[PDB]
Design a protein around this nucleic acid. Structure first.
Ligand SMILES: [Mg+2]
Ligand SMILES: [Mg+2]
Length: 1268
RNA sequence: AAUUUCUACUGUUGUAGAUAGAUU
């Protein structure tokens, strides 16, 4: 059996960055501290933190200015309003496309306007902090203007005192602009036109515009129905400052005057809002404002509606109240480093909750109590109020009705009888694909659903209303608990102390968590009402404007928990040490940007090799010529070997730029012919000719002529002449890109220069060069074991075997870092003193050490770090169309392939099954045990040992689980190569498992991702260097990871199949239970049992038999289930039940006589008694239960009611080795069967491009049943 | 209970596997 992956190696190139520690050598540290370089860069990091804040202030200013300047045409806004309001009442896919496009053209206008502005162009690049040509810095100009105009910008900021400091901080970065290269990338979004929730455009159109339109419609209707509601004269006198607007967009006339409430609500005048200042003005109009002298609040539109509602004593008028506009991004309104932060932030949050007053001017508790009481009182319109259809509704159904499926089944069935009573995608749109469901729909559906069910089993809508009537009671507990928190807060109020996370405080922490949990859970219950836009649907719906106005107002204030919850939790679970570090550049703006020899004086970083040890060194800025050609000539000696780095990147643009520019032109002497070639670009099929010259058709002789000129010029070039290019004969290539590729592949070359030890020692001794040793425990003298993979890669960079045909390449843009001391150095385990060994199975229970052992020693001392990127498979091309290649490879080699199916068990962390092409199981075992002869570690026992109330334990379990996964991906890899398999996982994107498992969906998703990334480059440490699977040749079975969503049905060699119906199936017969006896009602039970083909007693065998065809009741077949086994009945203690004896008892109890083996079907249908059918369906369900488990015994198994051709029943305990041994093994096995289907579809695919990797349940059932 | 970093460790100044850094 050859390895089907034997030739899948060196397939595609990918980048990786290796990490190492730098150990100062000789007098290096002494000189560095003497110059104080580290402290300077440390201050530079703090100045970075402040500098981000300054650049934020400039961003905020620019947002205001540009948005104030921006105008948008009335036609587009009116198109928006029209499609929007049309979309409210009727949801048409046409209006969906129309709404998206009408929205997108608004965003396009806003973005296209801002991007052409001058302040924006220099905003994200080097020119922001740097002075171009003569021009000074835009940011500095802004700061200087802010000092000249006497505005105090930074008074709010604690870090920055005054504008002079900000100017000095910004000037400090003038050559250091690269410090912000990451920062600017993140801020690039702020102005983006895409779907990002953090954008100025997104807030304008996606957030504020609908609210404004609603406010407009409420204003117009208010004028119509309530003409004297607003006092129009008085609002001008009070709010005049806000009523003043610079430009009227309706008439496009520029004049400064108070605007009429009619004018402010003109759709064209939205442009005066949409920026922070206008948003503030508008909001003041809506809600009113305060003047410091007055002592009373100036009334707003809303208060006028409120008071006029009092005069006429009408509650309807409040339905016209208006929602506040969202504040613009980066507006002037965080991280918890100590106990004071936890205490103060929590106190502030809950004080905000308690003191908040809604639009109705009552507390959140009072508002919600009044609100939900109204919903129960029926006063509200249930046609206009919606439940979100996500897990929130399922959770509601389970909460009140004790079944998650009731509501969904009820609405589906109700709508089915509604729109299609007589007899498909249409009903789905109305129910299953509906993003939000109306309360009216739920009530009607439930009533009609309850009409046919016994009063015993009925589920009532009044229960749901009572459920939400109950919620405000939670507030009382909150109010109580925070009072206790007050006393807890005082002891932890200390400013610098961390003691909250010590052991003595755990009880208080429990109190804190319980409080936060109560609030967070309260939010989760309310989350169902929230209206959240989801992609692929606008989710604009006709709604009660008062209900959602007050509810959204409460919800958004309450929703602040999740940031608070996450921050406090993160604080409690933080590790003893700290990972904080800051960048080290020694006096040089560009440190590692390239290793090139020509750029050595500029970049200042060089690499040495001494014996098997590797050293990095950095020349002092003043003396960077240390290694110039004369010096390496004078000092050549055998002590250290400096690395000579030569690279020709980007051949396509590099060759022409060098040969065809400036003085080089005269040197390289391009001929009149080849100059004609270049100008008209005849050498390129499609390329830009030199501007001013017209593109010509590709001519092959011309291209080859150009190649010849390039070769000649390479021979003349001083540096590239020594690269020793070996080129195919110029006549051989069909395209210029092939020559470029040869140039690029041979362009990277690494050589060494010997340097005397005395020269290195002296030059570091004088402070001229800083020498560090690149180190990890694999480089220690004591380390005889197997090295880290990264250690193998780093060693491989300089290996001669690698240098012949380059696999591992050295990359530029490396970085050095400094990490200060995070913890006291404590001797946890003194030497010569024995230690208990934590591993349960370890033979030696004690270990004795001659040297001290220090917990988390790496963080006890300051340390230097080095991050060096490298390129893997440099000569190989980029990765594309990988799945097609893999599928073809399987197509040819499918005779030899296997299926490795992995599943997260209920009693097992993970389980796998190797399956034959025919479907037999070659091997199955648990992943619980990770071990070699030295050590076996059982993660199942370890994990079960830990199991989780407090935050710290939950975190420890999660972290351990993720690390255990890091172990398991290797086992999977070994099995893949060994057995020639393909990995089959359950699909976690859609169709993920329902139940309770030892490994959560989120963690298992991590496992799938980790296995993808591991199979990107797969190396076995013991495999031979040159041979496949070795350091040079690593199996590449997967394309690089992209996103969880794009994993899809197949990634590389890994296939994701739906997990549905995996664990509930009979292995031999493929039996599935798709007919679920629920005992809906007596009559329905009679109909349900009547559909059975025949129900009788088998006299010879001794068990009852139920025979049926699914056609009468998704699944198809003739089954004839049996009662044979004993079933353990599912926390609370287990009892073993015998279905045969139970049925004997039930039938004997009634008139029915089974003892003759006559068919009972008619007699069963004869009884009208509730009790008979209730117990009968219960017994039948017991018969249908395949998985039986004892909670304490940790034993579960699968047995199936249907019989094979021999009449033997499948039992996991009596099962052979090629059949699943336990209940979880079944699920793994059937995941493999779905993979077998995918294997077959790969095997049989034809010239048609599309391979169908999606497995429908019908296909699943048919395949599984007849195959054996 | 030692680590470029992570998990489990003692597998002995480290052991097995994992490990794309930076940035927000
Ligand atoms: Mg090792
Ligand atoms: Mg540890």
């Amino acid at each position: 059996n050859a390895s089907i992956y034997q030739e899948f190696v060196n397939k595609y190139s990918l980048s990786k960055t290796l990490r190492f520690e730098l150990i100062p050598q000789g007098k290096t540290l002494e000189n560095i501290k003497a110059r104080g370089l580290i402290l300077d860069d440390e201050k530079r990091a703090k100045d970075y933190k402040k500098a981000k804040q300054i650049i934020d202030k400039y961003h905020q200013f620019f947002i205001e200015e540009i948005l104030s300047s921006v105008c948008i045409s009335e036609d587009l806004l009116q198109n928006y309003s029209d499609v929007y309001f049309k979309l409210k009442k009727s949801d048409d896919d046409n209006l969906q496309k129309d709404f998206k496009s009408a929205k997108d053209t608004i965003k396009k206008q806003i973005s296209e306007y801002i991007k052409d502005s001058e302040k924006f162009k220099n905003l994200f690049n080097q020119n922001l902090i740097d002075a171009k040509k003569g021009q000074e810095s835009d940011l500095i100009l802004w700061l200087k203007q802010s000092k000249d105009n006497g505005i105090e910008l930074f008074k709010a900021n604690s870090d920055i005192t005054d504008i002079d400091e900000a100017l000095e901080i910004i000037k400090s970065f003038k050559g250091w602009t690269t410090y912000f290269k990451g920062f600017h990338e993140n801020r690039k979004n702020v102005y983006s036109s895409n779907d990002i929730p953090t954008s100025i455009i997104y807030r304008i159109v996606d957030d504020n515009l609908p609210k404004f339109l609603e406010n407009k419609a409420k204003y117009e209707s208010l004028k119509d129905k309530a003409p004297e509601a607003i006092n129009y004269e008085q609002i001008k006198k009070d709010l005049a400052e806000e009523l003043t607007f610079d430009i009227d967009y309706k008439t496009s006339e520029v004049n400064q005057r108070v605007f009429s409430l009619d004018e402010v609500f003109e759709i064209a005048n939205f442009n005066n809002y949409l920026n922070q200042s206008g948003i503030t003005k508008f909001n003041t109009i809506i809600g009113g404002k305060f003047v410091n002298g007055e002592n009373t609040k100036r009334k707003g539109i809303n208060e006028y509606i409120n008071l006029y509602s009092q005069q006429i004593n009408d509650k309807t008028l409040k339905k016209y109240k208006m929602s506040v506009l969202f504040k613009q991004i980066l507006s002037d309104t965080d991280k918890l480093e100590d106990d004071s932060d936890v205490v103060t932030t929590m106190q502030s949050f809950y004080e905000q909750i308690a003191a908040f007053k809604t639009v109705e001017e009552k507390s959140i508790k009072e508002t919600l109590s009044l609100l939900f009481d109204d919903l129960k009182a029926q006063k509200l319109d249930l046609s206009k109020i919606y439940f979100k259809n996500d897990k929130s509704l399922t959770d509601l159904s389970q909460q009140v009705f004790d079944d998650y499926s009731v509501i969904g089944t009820a609405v589906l069935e109700y709508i089915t009888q509604q729109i299609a009573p007589k007899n498909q995608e249409l009903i789905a749109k109305k129910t299953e694909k509906a993003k939000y469901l109306s309360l009216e729909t739920i009530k009607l559906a439930l009533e009609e659903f309850n009409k046919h069910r016994d009063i015993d089993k009925q589920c009532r809508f009044e229960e749901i209303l009572a459920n939400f009537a109950a919620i405000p009671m939670i507030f009382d507990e909150i109010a109580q608990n925070k009072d206790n928190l007050a006393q807890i807060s005082i002891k932890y109020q200390n400013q610098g102390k961390k003691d909250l996370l010590q052991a003595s405080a755990e009880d208080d922490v429990k109190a804190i968590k319980d409080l936060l949990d109560q609030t967070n859970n309260l939010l989760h219950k309310l989350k169902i009402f929230h209206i959240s836009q989801s992609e692929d649907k606008a989710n604009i719906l006709d709604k009660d404007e008062h209900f959602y106005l007050v509810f959204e107002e409460c919800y958004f204030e309450l929703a602040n928990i999740v940031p608070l919850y996450n921050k406090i939790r993160n604080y409690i679970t933080q590790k003893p040490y700290s990972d904080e570090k800051f960048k080290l550049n020694f006096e040089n703006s560009t440190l590692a940007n390239g290793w090139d020899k020509n750029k050595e004086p500029d970049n200042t970083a060089i690499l040495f090799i001494k014996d098997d040890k590797y050293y990095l060194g950095v020349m002092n800025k003043k003396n960077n010529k240390i290694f110039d050609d004369k010096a390496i000539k004078e000092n050549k000696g055998e002590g250290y070997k400096k690395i000579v780095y030569k690279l020709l990147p980007g051949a396509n643009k590099m060759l022409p730029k060098v040969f065809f520019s400036a003085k080089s032109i005269k040197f390289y002497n391009p001929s009149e012919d080849i100059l004609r070639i270049r100008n008209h670009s005849t050498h390129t099929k499609n390329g830009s000719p030199q501007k001013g010259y017209e593109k010509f058709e590709f001519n092959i002789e011309d291209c080859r002529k150009f190649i010849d000129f390039y070769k000649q010029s390479i021979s003349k070039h001083p540096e590239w002449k020594d690269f020793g290019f070996r080129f195919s004969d110029t006549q051989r290539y069909n395209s210029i890109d092939e020559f470029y590729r040869e140039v690029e592949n041979q362009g990277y070359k690494l050589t060494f220069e010997n340097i005397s030890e005395s020269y290195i020692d002296s030059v570091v001794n004088q402070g001229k060069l800083y020498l560090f040793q690149i180190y990890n425990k694999d480089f220690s003298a004591y380390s005889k074991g197997r090295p880290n993979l990264h250690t193998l890669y780093w060693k491989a960079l300089f290996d001669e075997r690698n240098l012949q045909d380059v696999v591992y390449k050295l990359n530029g843009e490396a970085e050095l870092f400094y990490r200060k001391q995070s913890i006291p150095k404590k001797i946890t385990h003194p030497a010569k003193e024995a230690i208990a060994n934590k591993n349960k199975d370890n033979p030696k229970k004690e270990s004795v050490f001659e040297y001290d052992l220090i917990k988390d020693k790496r963080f006890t001392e300051d340390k230097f770090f080095f991050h060096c990127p490298i390129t893997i498979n440099f000569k190989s091309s980029g990765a594309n169309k990988f799945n097609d290649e893999i599928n073809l490879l399987l197509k040819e080699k499918a005779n030899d392939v296997h299926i490795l199916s992995i599943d997260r068990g209920e009693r097992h962390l993970a389980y796998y099954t190797l399956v034959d092409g025919k479907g037999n199981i070659i091997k199955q075992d648990t992943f619980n045990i990770i071990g070699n002869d030295r050590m076996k570690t059982n993660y199942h026992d370890k994990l079960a040992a830990i199991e989780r109330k407090d935050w710290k334990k939950i975190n420890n379990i999660k972290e351990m689980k993720e690390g255990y996964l890091s172990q398991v991906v290797h086992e999977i890899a070994k099995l893949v190569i060994e057995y020639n398999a393909i990995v089959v996982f359950e699909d976690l994107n859609f169709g993920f498992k329902r139940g309770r498992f030892k490994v959560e969906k989120q963690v298992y998703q991590k496992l799938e991702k980790m296995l993808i990334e591991k199979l990107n480059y797969l190396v076995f440490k013991d495999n031979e260097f040159d041979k496949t699977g070795g350091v040079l040749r690593a199996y590449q079975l997967t394309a690089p990871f992209e996103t969880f969503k794009k994993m899809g049905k197949q990634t590389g060699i890994i296939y994701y199949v739906p997990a549905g119906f995996t664990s509930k199936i009979c292995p031999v017969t493929g039996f599935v239970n798709q007919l679920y006896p629920k005992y809906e009602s007596v009559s329905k039970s009679q109909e349900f049992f009547s559909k059975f083909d025949k129900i009788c007693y088998n006299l010879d065998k001794g068990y009852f038999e139920f025979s049926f065809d699914y056609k009468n009741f998704a699944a198809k077949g003739k089954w004839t289930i049996a009662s044979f086994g004993s079933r353990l009945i599912n926390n609370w203690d287990t009892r073993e039940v015998y279905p045969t004896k139970e049925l004997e008892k039930l039938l004997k109890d009634y008139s029915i006589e089974y003892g003759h083996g006559e068919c009972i079907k008619a007699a069963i249908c004869g009884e009208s008694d509730k009790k008979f059918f209730a117990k009968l369906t219960s017994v039948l369900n017991t018969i249908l239960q395949m998985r039986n488990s004892k909670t304490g015994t940790e034993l579960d198994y699968l047995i199936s009611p249907v019989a094979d051709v021999n009449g033997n029943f499948f039992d996991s305990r009596q099962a052979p080795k090629n059949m699943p041994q336990d209940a979880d093994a079944n699920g793994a096995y059937h995941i493999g069967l779905k993979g077998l289907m995918l294997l077959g579809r790969i095997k049989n695919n034809q010239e048609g491009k599309k391979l169908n990797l999606v497995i429908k349940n019908e296909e699943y059932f048919e395949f599984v049943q007849n195959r054996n």
